[PDB]
């Protein structure tokens, strides 16, 4: 199915490429035709053709191909240097996280976990699921876009609904919930 294919290139392309044989590039970037080889080492019968349209009709806009590379936009545990094109006109973002997470937020901002970007959402709703992977207690933290903006902050396009940010100041938290 597809959900099964691309639970697998997720997992290829953001954690473990090594493990199939690839290398990815400073920009997260592999061969789609070697992707294909890897997968078909667990799904024999997928095609390059079925990856493409995987890529094409995913709700979340996960991945990026251009040329004969593929990558995962956003949620490598691995050094990438991602160079989405700049969101500009967000004027709110948010960020979700657990409640024991505030006291350190608020005394240091909110700052990425080695990951070197902060995961940020357009919406409320998808900021929630996002928190709800840390725990129960999820708290959504409003984020003055312009105010990282003016600060300096770069906030790019990571995904159709993600967004990413070297780091938030305190100043730029608006509310909780
Ligand atoms: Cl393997
Ligand atoms: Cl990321």
Not at 83 to 98: A, F, I, N, Q, W
Not at 150 to 155: S, V
Request: proline share 3%; hydrophobic share 35%; aromatic share 10%.
């Amino acid at each position: 199915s597809r959900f099964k294919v691309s639970k697998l290139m997720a997992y290829i392309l953001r954690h473990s490429p090594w493990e199939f044989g690839l290398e990815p590039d400073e920009e997260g970037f592999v061969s789609i035709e070697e992707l294909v080889n890897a997968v078909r080492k667990v799904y024999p019968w997928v095609t390059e053709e079925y990856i493409r349209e995987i890529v094409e009709r995913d709700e979340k806009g996960r991945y990026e191909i251009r040329g004969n590379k593929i990558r995962a936009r956003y949620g490598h545990s691995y050094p990438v240097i991602l160079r989405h094109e700049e969101d500009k006109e967000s004027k709110v973002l948010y960020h979700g996280t657990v409640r024991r997470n505030l006291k350190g937020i608020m005394r240091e901002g909110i700052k990425p976990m080695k990951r070197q970007y902060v995961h940020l959402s357009i919406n409320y709703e998808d900021a929630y699921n996002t928190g709800m992977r840390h725990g129960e207690d999820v708290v959504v933290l409003i984020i003055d876009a312009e105010c990282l903006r003016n600060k300096g902050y770069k906030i790019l396009k990571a995904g159709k609904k993600v967004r990413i940010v070297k780091h938030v100041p305190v100043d730029c938290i608006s509310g909780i919930l």
